[PDB]
């Protein structure tokens, strides 16, 4: 006797077998990031995002971030990365 070919529980009965490996960094990447950031600083658009964030315009800082990066998800990360610098200071 054979499964079914339609629906959510679809397919011939087998025991399907892969690890969602995470491509990440090590704990030393934080040291490298802090060393480089102090030696270099912030770009012109990073500085302009810091000023908007201080005044409380989070949405405008995201619209500015999206403008200079082009991606909504990358605009979010820059906004969160910048706001973590503001709380450090």
């Amino acid at each position: 006797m054979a499964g079914i070919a339609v629906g959510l529980k679809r397919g011939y009965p087998v025991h399907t077998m892969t690890a969602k490996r995470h491509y990440g960094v090590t704990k030393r990447k934080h040291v490298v990031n802090d060393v480089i950031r102090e030696a270099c600083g912030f770009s012109a658009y990073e500085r302009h995002m810091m000023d908007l964030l201080r005044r409380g315009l989070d949405k405008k800082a995201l619209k500015y971030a999206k403008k200079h990066l082009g991606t909504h998800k990358r605009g979010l990360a820059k906004r969160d990365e910048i706001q973590r610098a503001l709380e450090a200071i």
């Binding site: 490298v32 990031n33 060393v35 480089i36 030696a39 270099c40 600083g41 770009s43 012109a44």
Partner: protein, 204 residues
Amino acid sequence: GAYKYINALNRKKQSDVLRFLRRIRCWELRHLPRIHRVARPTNPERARRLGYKPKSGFVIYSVRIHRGNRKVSARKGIVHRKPACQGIHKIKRVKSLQAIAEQRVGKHCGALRVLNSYFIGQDSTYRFFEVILVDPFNAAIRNDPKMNWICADKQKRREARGLTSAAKKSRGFTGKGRRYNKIGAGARGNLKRRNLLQLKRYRS
């Protein structure tokens, strides 16, 4: 290691430190000849990644190229064409400026092999690259099992045939799959194969 910080630092090209140093370098290269040898690469991280090894037979050449766009070379901008081909401006080169500069260096030094090239800086008028060149007749390069592939005859004038990374990117070899159907194993060869009319010996 030292090079894991230089690589991290070199991504912050909009920092004031790197912007200042590139200003000094770009000013200096505006007066020196167009193509000339430099003692050591100005970006040793990027040079080492692309294949430069600080041994005998490896030399670094700096080439300055006038970036931007140019007009179609027609006398007084007059072309006896249909309105579909009557455009003089706004027409862009297909080969990247990096690939064009590589050919200028390779033509200048015909006895060396262009390994790869990278980007140094740019201003309102020029863009400056650096080209890694290898002497194929050096006893050190010939006797290296990991590098004597450059001594093959087919590697003569690599950049002109389109074998370097810069010239291969402009050939379309930047990826694989359904996005690159027309650039499978050579864009011009692919067109010929698809257009071949096969006439078998026994056909209906």
